[PDB]
Design a protein around this ligand. Sequence first.
Ligand SMILES: [Au+]
Ligand SMILES: [Au+]
Ligand SMILES: [Au+]
Ligand SMILES: [Au+]
Ligand SMILES: [Au+]
Ligand SMILES: [Au+]
Ligand code: NI
Ligand code: NI
Ligand code: NI
Ligand code: NI
Ligand SMILES: [O-]
Ligand SMILES: [O-]
Lengths: 100, 100, 100, 122, 570, 570
Amino acid sequence: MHLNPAEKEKLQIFLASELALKRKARGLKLNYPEAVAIITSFIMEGARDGKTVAMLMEEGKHVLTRDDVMEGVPEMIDDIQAEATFPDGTKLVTVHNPIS
Amino acid sequence: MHLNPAEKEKLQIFLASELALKRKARGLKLNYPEAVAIITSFIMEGARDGKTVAMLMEEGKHVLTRDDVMEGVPEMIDDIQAEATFPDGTKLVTVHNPIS
Amino acid sequence: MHLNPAEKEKLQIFLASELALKRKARGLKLNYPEAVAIITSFIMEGARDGKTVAMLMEEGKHVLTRDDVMEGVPEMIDDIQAEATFPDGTKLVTVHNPIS
Amino acid sequence: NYIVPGEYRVAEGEIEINAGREKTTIRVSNTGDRPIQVGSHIHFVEVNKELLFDRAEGIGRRLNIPSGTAARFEPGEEMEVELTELGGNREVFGISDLTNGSVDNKELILQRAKELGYKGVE
Amino acid sequence: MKINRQQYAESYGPTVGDQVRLADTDLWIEVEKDYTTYGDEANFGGGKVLREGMGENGTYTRTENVLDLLLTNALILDYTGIYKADIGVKDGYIVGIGKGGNPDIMDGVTPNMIVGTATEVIAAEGKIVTAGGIDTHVHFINPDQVDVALANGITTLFGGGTGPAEGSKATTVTPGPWNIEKMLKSTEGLPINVGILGKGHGSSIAPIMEQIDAGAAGLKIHEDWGATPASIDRSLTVADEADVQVAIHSDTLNEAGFLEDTLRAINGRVIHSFHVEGAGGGHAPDIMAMAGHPNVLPSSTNPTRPFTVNTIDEHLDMLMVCHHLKQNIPEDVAFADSRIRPETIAAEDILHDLGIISMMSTDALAMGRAGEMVLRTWQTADKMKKQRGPLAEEKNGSDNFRAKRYVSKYTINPAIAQGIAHEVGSIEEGKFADLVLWEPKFFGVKADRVIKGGIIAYAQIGDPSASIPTPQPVMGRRMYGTVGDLIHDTNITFMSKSSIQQGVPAKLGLKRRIGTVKNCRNIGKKDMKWNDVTTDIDINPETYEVKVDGEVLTCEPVKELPMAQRYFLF
Amino acid sequence: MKINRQQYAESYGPTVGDQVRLADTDLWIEVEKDYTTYGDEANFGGGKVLREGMGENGTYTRTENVLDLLLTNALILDYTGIYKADIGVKDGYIVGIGKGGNPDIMDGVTPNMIVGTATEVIAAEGKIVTAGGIDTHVHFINPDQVDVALANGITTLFGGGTGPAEGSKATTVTPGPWNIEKMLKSTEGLPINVGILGKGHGSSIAPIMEQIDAGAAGLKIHEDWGATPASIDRSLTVADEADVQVAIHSDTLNEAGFLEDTLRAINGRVIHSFHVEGAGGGHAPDIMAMAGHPNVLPSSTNPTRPFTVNTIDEHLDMLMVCHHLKQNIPEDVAFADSRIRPETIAAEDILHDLGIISMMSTDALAMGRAGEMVLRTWQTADKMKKQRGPLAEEKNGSDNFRAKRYVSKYTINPAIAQGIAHEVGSIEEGKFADLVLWEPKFFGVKADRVIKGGIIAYAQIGDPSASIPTPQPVMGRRMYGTVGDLIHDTNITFMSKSSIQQGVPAKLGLKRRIGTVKNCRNIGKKDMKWNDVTTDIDINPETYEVKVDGEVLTCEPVKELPMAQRYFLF
Ligand SMILES: [Au+]
Ligand SMILES: [Au+]
Ligand SMILES: [Au+]
Ligand SMILES: [Au+]
Ligand SMILES: [Au+]
Ligand SMILES: [Au+]
Ligand code: NI
Ligand code: NI
Ligand code: NI
Ligand code: NI
Ligand SMILES: [O-]
Ligand SMILES: [O-]
């Protein structure tokens, strides 16, 4: 596989997202780390799909709404940042106030 | 996300449980580590759901039966212990002879 | 669970395979690490099922075809090697040119 | 324009090995009941005792095969091999302890070979 | 008052006559004797015996016969016996095996086994305790291999390598003074005992000898560096002068000689024959005939142990990868068929059971598995019981004789061969306190706690953030013995006498305990505990049939093994 | 006997005239010469050449011309050439480049490249071998960044920081004697070469100078600490006296002066201009004009390399986060538009290809990627071939000239700028043995093996519990070079001459190799290998259009790059 250090670490984010999505599916309101994991994994998978940074900046704001999460969680998340490999290399994506 | 050391470690248990549940679904009798992973993850997910320690002490004994596991596995597992965050903080759950 | 060092590491391979299979399911052509993860996990799960080394040497060559992967990936993978616990202990499986 | 990552485009022609060194062909027979395989760079006179050939012809020489390859003799097998000359200082130490010095001392090499029972000292 | 046997064993571990199953095998060990005084058993906890004025003496200072550490109620499995006792440790050494406690009020206390203010306690009731495993065939290729070894109860690594360099990937060799010095400094950070082998190759003495002076603890002769008559001879000359061991992987290709030529070059001197069966390397096809000679110390590597249905298919293809062989080169096919032989692999099972092969080893990361020496030793023992029955010598329906024969293969015998048995290799008084605790259900599979120099180095333990240590996930982890400077005190670097006399440790700034390699040259097959058989071993050049004293040795592969799928996640 | 070229290259790696594709790029390198003697190639393994009495000499001791390590059949890519040779290493240094083996029986053996008893072997046939990367723009923010760097072939880190403190997150600065001392002691545990930069700010000499005496290896001027005429001047005065390099991130805001004022303060003295294009910081909008002056050593940081379709969107928003900018403050919007310019980012591609910008660097964790300096250098080279075609100077349809120009940007040129090129930066005799092996399919993406001071420090290797090292999972791991005390011997802490003369290493108990920074002050743009072009660079104040000698430099962004999605899991 030739995994580098970053690749090892980012697998954890995917795992946390899977865990969080299962918790959502059984009707739980999501907490802080679950919400962050979901949006982050969304961004990285979007980059894998070949979306642009601009597309993901827009879409990232509609992954979870306030009725998906616990009280206070929207206000706890100022922005979410993730780096992933786009078709044109590694790029940073920042989603500002993802949960409105 | 702000993962602490315990949160990092416990993701592994969830992963092992997913692996084990897939193996069960294709008709395999489960071994020692698979059985332990399944019951442990059940307890932690139950705590996330807001169940009580007492509920999980009861339920934990009916997650797997002896026809789910290999010969000797029921006798190998004396108890299973797990700590998770309940709505009222971290608590220890112990399930005694989970596989009867 | 009593996880040893190898067991810890190999959970990662399973996770990478899950990630890669999801990416395949949404219609993406797989890259080098994704392809390797898929075939490797296939071998290890086959050993868990009680298949023989000889069976897995054959089957491993039909898990992914060249229309499943990106240009150049078939030629990048000379062989894939994995060790897993068969009913008769740990054995090494090698699949040569898995993607034809 | 299909891209194979890290592929070679080798130039035209062939590579000649051991160019300008004298070549010699001899017959060699494995008189033993177990297989013998001989590497490209062992001083040929010093090979296994149960190989029969004109031992004098192996002195100062090695197999004329690509570096790192070997010649295989099945039990009872007789075949021809080609030898090339040793280079550098033309000295051999250790191995079977038949030379331990210049390859020019053919008389002494052969005398040691005969006493120790290397076959084909004629 | 009387306690029934079931409740006694549940509280204090088994006593005389009781039997215990080894993991999920068909092997049973029986307690041969017990050093306790019934009613005065040592134990620790709330309202228990080891308390001040009671089972713990409150008068004596550390120097007055008081222990640093007591292991209570251990079931010891060792070449010296299978028995029940307390184990006493002081200054990192085993000082007493017997009965610990307080002579104030208790009968039968071993005089130097007082529990006092200085004493730590480990409860071993219901555990099996063995010596740490001694692996004498290690390639130093990947530092991750150390935890793998510790997790299966190995405490000493002998071999060579500089990491994933081709020379190291092929041979247990750390070549020359500089590389040896570098790896000695590397060893300062490895939580396990280490001895380093130099390159046993050259036609003059000096290039070989300077490795011994540099710090090497022995030499390796390997066909890849040229296992010629000259290299064999010079290495054994150096070894006789320096008092270190030589290991050999002989000339598979029979290029400079056949087996009999190698033996002529050895000329009756002592030698350790690696992977003697031959799948791992050596004179095709009759290398295994080495195992019959009085001057040979024979070991197996682990991937051929034991003979199972997947073995041949796995090995044929392993060899093709390992040796870069091609299917369309008939010489390569001939080579593979001359090397991977079901006849000799099958016989190897039997030779072990008869005590003709004396030792196990891994061949870690070159053609063997770092964490499976102990595991595959017991799988072999179990397979041989199923196929050959209980040994003639067995009494009481137990497998005690076989258990002693087999435990010797990875503990005492490698220690003797290497010249380190004065420090390690067995649970005896005066030896270094390398100890492995096993739950009987995990015996030979996953070590519970690994003690190095009297301090826990490795343990299967749970969540570090939990209220108690047992909650999930329970996994193998490094303990305090491996942290900070304690790693220096709890581990041994074994070195040659000349390098010690020349002050190499000070020169290099080594802070680890320094062990002396000695008494390697005046031993033979007869010195291998429970495995001292010499005999005429014949291997048919045409059929590869193995004969021991005119009798044909044949065995069947098995479809299934214990200590396998019940235990492992992958 | 003759071997056909295809089979020869498959067995020994390519020879004269053969070409190799760099990863999945359109770049081809061609073997220019070969030091071998056809038929006497060195190789290691069962029945191979490097065996006692054959290709390995069995007579000589280590001191008599014998190597510690031989890398066989390397395809070297270096500023000095693209060619085939054996590489010989001794005492952690490259001592011979040529042909290794045994002069007993082989023709053409380089006299000091004898394979003897002391010699370890690494097989490099079929591999590309380069010098370790030298990253001169590192923020020490997170210790995890070291493995990231090693995995992409970086072996030396120059920069500053004390961890995730705001000063360190913004600037490559370790401020003052105490912080410098602390980080020097921290460096004892980092498996990579390190040099530390002090704060190049102050209006008196002494507060700046005391950092050099304390152990700093250079200085950083940064606008965040006040890149004023005074700070610029004092730092260059200190630097001229101490013989260390100064790096500059100039006054983006033009507060105390414009670009021409900064140059007046520099006054013709030597200076390293960081992220010269300007997205990473500097006089808005014309900072890139620095790259034309004879006294300036210009480097790029990596996130603008090369110009792609996502670049601008990514950078605009990166800057807003990095600088805490607000969308509803028009001054912030003006600031961002004056700083993130598609015109200068595009021209930067071209300036690299023409050899006007001499160096690459990361800007690790502040505005750049720790493991992507090498990666993005080749992506730029590849993009420029696709858009501009093969360079005029190219012969034989190969890209050898471009490959030398680009490899120089992250190896030799940063070494020269920093004053450390006598130790590192290239594969030449007498230099420290920091070497990177690459499979051509992974070239510039994922290093196969990283050698530090003659010992493997990092490798892509598989399951530590497996029978061989290649089974999955194959991942980057630290090797024995990083363990115990060996970490001290295989790595260099670079320090100023005055701190060395004052005995700082002994004072602090530093055990690492100490390197001397020297010859920084009498160099210029003309000393940058393959990248020595000086010219008039004009940047239009209204349109940001870049002109080099009256000609307008324009480039297009690309939608896709090689060395990207084919390789990475995320
Ligand atoms: Au092999
Ligand atoms: Au092998
Ligand atoms: Au049998
Ligand atoms: Au910023
Ligand atoms: Au920035
Ligand atoms: Au362009
Ligand atoms: Ni071997
Ligand atoms: Ni070996
Ligand atoms: Ni900057
Ligand atoms: Ni910076
Ligand atoms: O071996
Ligand atoms: O910067």
